[PDB]
């Protein structure tokens, strides 16, 4: 699809057998989902933004579907207000910026 | 252009006569630049992101040039880790997400 930026570019994702809304975020290296009980091994991570850092759990090799497009990779899970689709997965779905 | 996301979508901007590098950030409602001097009146404001809320200076109707494209809009200055072009200006240069 083509998503304009008048509004926050929110999409539906499928992850860990759940449907969810997430932000397509060219400003994010990584993918950060709101607290959820993913099964799987994980390691602790700190990630930064505007106001400091939060601790998240890193899960590797996690299959995910973004608006019908399948991908698989690292997902961080922590106390983010918004589901964030970062570049690691945006490249997998063929997403670009165009102007 | 078309811009892929294997690397951070970083661009040169011209603001206030000065060149800087900035990240094209579809996950930001607003444009927030590192500490710098800008001419005009500014209002104190707060914004938030991952890691919490920061204090910023708000400049309205600032012209900025982004990869040769002209915008004039609100620009925020403060302790952001990176110069960030948000949707307020990305809409002005006709930026979309495509996949």
């Amino acid at each position: 699809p083509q998503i304009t930026l008048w509004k926050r570019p929110l999409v539906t994702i499928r992850i860990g057998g759940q449907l969810k809304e997430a932000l397509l975020n060219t400003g994010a290296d990584d993918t950060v989902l709101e607290e959820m009980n993913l099964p799987g091994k994980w390691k602790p991570k700190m990630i930064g933004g505007i106001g400091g850092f939060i601790k998240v759990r890193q899960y590797d090799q996690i299959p995910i579907e973004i608006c019908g497009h399948k991908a698989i990779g690292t997902v961080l899970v922590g106390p983010t207000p918004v589901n964030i689709i970062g570049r690691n997965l945006l490249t997998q779905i063929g997403c670009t910026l165009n102007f | 252009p078309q811009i892929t996301l294997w690397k951070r979508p970083l661009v040169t901007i011209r603001i206030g006569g000065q060149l800087k590098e900035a990240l094209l950030n579809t996950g930001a409602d607003d444009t927030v630049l590192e500490e710098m001097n800008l001419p005009g009146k500014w209002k104190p404001k707060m914004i938030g992101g991952i890691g919490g809320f920061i204090k910023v200076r708000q400049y309205d109707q600032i012209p900025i040039e982004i990869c040769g494209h002209k915008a004039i809009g609100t620009v925020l200055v403060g302790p952001t880790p990176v110069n960030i072009i948000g949707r307020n200006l990305l809409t002005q240069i006709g930026c979309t997400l495509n996949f």
Binding site: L23, N25, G27, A28, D29, D30, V32, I47, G48, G49, I50, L76, T80, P81, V82, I84, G86, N88 | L23, N25, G27, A28, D29, D30, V32, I47, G48, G49, I50, T80, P81, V82, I84, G86
Partner: peptide
């Protein structure tokens, strides 16, 4: 407003 720069 809200600004979701993520540094990984």
């Amino acid at each position: 407003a809200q600004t979701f720069y993520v540094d990984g």
